[PDB]
Design a protein around this ligand. Structure first.
Ligand code: HEM
Ligand code: HEM
Ligand SMILES: Cc1cc(N)nc(C[C@@H]2CNC[C@@H]2OCCNCC(F)(F)c2cccc(F)c2)c1
Ligand SMILES: Cc1cc(N)nc(C[C@@H]2CNC[C@@H]2OCCNCC(F)(F)c2cccc(F)c2)c1
Ligand SMILES: C[C@H](O)[C@H](O)[C@H]1CNc2nc(N)[nH]c(=O)c2N1
Ligand SMILES: C[C@H](O)[C@H](O)[C@H]1CNc2nc(N)[nH]c(=O)c2N1
Ligand SMILES: [Zn+2]
Lengths: 407, 411
């Protein structure tokens, strides 16, 4: 029942008891581990609400109090009569923060309790969604001094009136297939860009075109909105040593903001809940720039560095990778836009894990995602055993709405 | 039933059926994943089924399933177990079994090579001196003056668990470690405990930074005995850098032959507690782990100091810069000395081709992503982007606890 995790660098051993509260399935079984797979009614709703409210009242040291019992009574009456219920503001804030706390793939959770929650449950139209999202963008960006935030649109009802942000992130670049076979812009976004144009977007047809928002309110057909250009903070990428680096013409945006997940709190489902923090540098320098399926820039940089590209064993890919990641960090830091390096972020996560074991009895963590995509074992998380399990409140991936939607 | 894995870079999707042949447990449940946990006497009753499963697999592989030879071998083994409580593998079976234990090793990125394994049958061995001679021969054959050849030496199987053959060393070749009164460590800090055991057993320690440890060998459950591998059989590579002439004066070297000696080989329910095996290094093992782990030789600072990197803030990525240069130096040095080594790009690319082939001909390839992805430059290797399924197939290699914890000292 009680499980131990060992750090092999320090010999520190921690005991996990929190996993006993896990509810949902991992995808693994006693016969098969799926650790590396990316995607592994009134009757159902009351136990979910009760479980949540119990943890909430426990959190504020009022478990088994009259107010605890009265709220449980209130919620039960509301579900029986209306088939759902509404969260109190205090409950919504607690829930959003805990969804982040429970996000096993997130290295940045030392920050979990510092989250600004924007209650957008009074929103009714796609134009309303756009205004809420602009305000989130401006608040979170804060002229480069980034602040974590989430904006929460109305919860699911019958499932035919969902609020959804069609975009995977609030800010991303367009991709276009070229009449010569190559891709201009971000190849990740070709399909979404096409849907945008199909819905009327006038595409600039450049390499770094900020995509418009496609917003769905109340199960309606999604609508197109452009984020005011002056709210989208971008960083030109230069290198502190290589003057030629700026000539690659690279830039990235300052605000990482995931907009396609589903927030579950107390059995209630918030299908539009865009949230934002700040970048860890490797996301941009390793994945966005160097994935073969993305901007794929390793060859160009290595050439400009005049490395021997004839043999893999010269480690030319590795040398150029480090330089790209040095450039990303330098550029953000020079322009006073919040960023964290992978050494700093992983060190903080280990401290967060220790805090969580001490105060909560554990911390669900997914090693496959937590270990950075470069220099893995020179970061402390590589050497740390982690247990992965699912706790609620939670964030869950949801499929692209253009698969599901009927026009 | 069918399980799919996807490659997120190529969109190639593969379908696993081989997982249906798995019966042993992973550590994981529907409620918890233990994929990053390093560590997640048989009765007759349990032995014949295991022997039957194995022999069925072997006879299928030689296309003789259900033959008279297959049926006669089943009867022969059944009678041997009923009568003696165990059985002996034919040489052909032992070879097939050792190759399949490697093919099945989900943490091994080098498995494209699995069918090329030289098997040394040491089941006639009776004493520690006998074990020493067999291990010396293994080292010489596998080293092959730098042109490394994969091999395994298999000592007698477990009988009652009171007469185990064991190599106490975790690898045939490793360097000593010495803890100093001031808390600093000379040599490899991973080996301090074992080094103290060797000294207690009578080893005269040179007390330098790269002293090759002696072998500590246990035959037939007896107390282990110390033996020094002839120095002329231990091939080493001094580490230098192609551009940085100061790299040589760090005084680094490493041994050419990686040889794991602490694992248990299970074939058909039989347990081979002493089965040292060897291949060749992937460079990152040495350049990333052995040299740069904080708990090992821990050379990053000294290298970065000599490179004159900005060390006041981690965001200069000085650790990452020094890491790459160290790994270039390891590959360069081995290559210049004509000692077989593989870089992480080549090894992972070959692994993906191996895995795809296995899906096509075998219906699967169990793989442990946490171990298969290299400890540097993870996402610029193709394995990072490849979904994997981890499950346990037999024959297999299993970790066993260090024998000094469990040994009954005879005196
Ligand atoms: C404040 C700074 C933050 C940092 C440095 C950070 C860092 C990261 C990183 C590096 C990842 C892996 C992302 C990837 O590889 O795509 C991640 C994932 C994730 N983060 Fe955090 N994060 C931060 C804030 C937040 C916030 C505010 C939330 C929610 C309120 C959050 C929830 C999540 C979730 C749910 C995932 C998994 C996403 C997915 O499945 O695609 N993070 N984070
Ligand atoms: C021929 C070249 C080979 C290469 C490049 C190679 C590469 C590797 C690497 C990089 C690892 C992870 C090592 C670590 O992090 O400690 C590994 C693990 C492993 N290898 Fe291979 N290997 C080779 C040959 C072999 C052979 C000949 C066998 C057995 C016959 C074998 C069986 C295993 C096993 C059982 C593990 C898991 C070890 C453990 O749990 O400690 N390998 N290999
Ligand atoms: C298939 C699938 C499943 C899943 N759960 N998730 C995905 C998104 C992928 C994961 N890996 C790359 C891409 O995710 C891109 C988004 N990255 C995270 C971030 F940049 F948006 C971010 C960083 C810090 C804070 C913050 F709020 C947001 C795909
Ligand atoms: C706790 C625990 C469990 C486990 N299964 N295993 C360990 C050995 C660890 C794994 N990671 C570092 C160390 O293993 C060190 C040995 N590495 C493998 C090698 F170098 F010997 C080798 C390389 C290529 C071919 C070959 F035949 C041998 C510890
Ligand atoms: C197949 C494998 O699970 C996949 O490539 C994962 C690996 N680890 C990751 N880790 C993070 N942080 N983000 C990712 O997108 C991925 N991708
Ligand atoms: C805790 C974690 O599982 C551990 O540090 C693992 C990670 N991946 C590894 N991968 C390899 N090849 N070898 C190792 O020793 C490890 N160590
Ligand atoms: Zn698992």
């Amino acid at each position: 029942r009680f499980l131990k995790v060992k750090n092999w660098e320090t010999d520190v051993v921690l005991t996990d008891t929190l996993h006993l509260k896990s509810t949902l399935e991992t995808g693994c079984t006693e016969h098969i581990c799926m650790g590396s797979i990316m995607l592994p009614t009134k009757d159902q709703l009351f136990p979910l609400a009760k479980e949540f409210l119990d943890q909430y009242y426990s959190s504020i040291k009022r478990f088994g109090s009259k107010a605890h019992m009265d709220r449980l009574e209130e919620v039960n009456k509301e579900i029986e009569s209306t088939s759902t219920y509404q969260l109190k503001d205090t409950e919504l804030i607690y829930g959003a923060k805990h969804a982040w706390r429970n996000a096993s793939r997130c290295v940045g959770r030392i920050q979990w309790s510092k989250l600004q929650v924007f209650d957008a449950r009074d929103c009714t139209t796609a134009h309303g969604m756009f205004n809420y999202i602009c305000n989130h963008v401006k608040y979170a960006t804060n002229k480069g001094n980034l602040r974590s935030a989430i904006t929460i649109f109305p919860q699911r009802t019958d499932g035919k009136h969902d609020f959804r942000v069609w975009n995977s992130q609030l800010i991303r670049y367009a991709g276009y297939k070229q009449p010569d076979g190559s891709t201009l812009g971000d190849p990740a976004n070709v399909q979404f860009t096409e849907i945008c144009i199909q819905q009327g977007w006038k595409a600039p047809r450049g390499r770094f075109d900020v995509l418009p928002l496609l917003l769905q309110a109340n199960g309606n057909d999604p609508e197109l909105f452009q984020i005011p250009p002056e709210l989208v903070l971008e960083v030109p990428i230069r290198h502190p040593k290589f003057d030629w680096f700026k000539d690659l013409g690279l830039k990235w945006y300052g605000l990482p903001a995931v907009s396609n997940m589903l927030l579950e709190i107390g059995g209630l489902e918030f299908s539009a809940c865009p949230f934002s923090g700040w970048y860890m540098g490797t996301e941009i320098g390793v994945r966005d720039y160097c994935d073969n399926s993305r901007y794929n820039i390793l060859e160009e940089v290595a050439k400009k560095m005049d490395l021997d590209m004839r043999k893999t064993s010269s480690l030319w890919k590795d040398q150029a990778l480090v330089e790209i990641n040095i450039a990303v960090l330098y550029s953000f830091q020079s322009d006073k836009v919040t960023i964290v390096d992978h050494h700093s972020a992983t060190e903080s996560f280990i401290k967060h894990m220790e805090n969580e074991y001490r105060c909560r009895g554990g911390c669900p963590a997914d090693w496959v995602w937590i270990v950075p995509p470069m220099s893995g074992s020179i970061t402390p998380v590589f050497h740390q055993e982690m247990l992965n399990y699912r706790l609620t409140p939670s964030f869950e991936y949801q499929p692209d709405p253009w698969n599901t939607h009927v026009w």
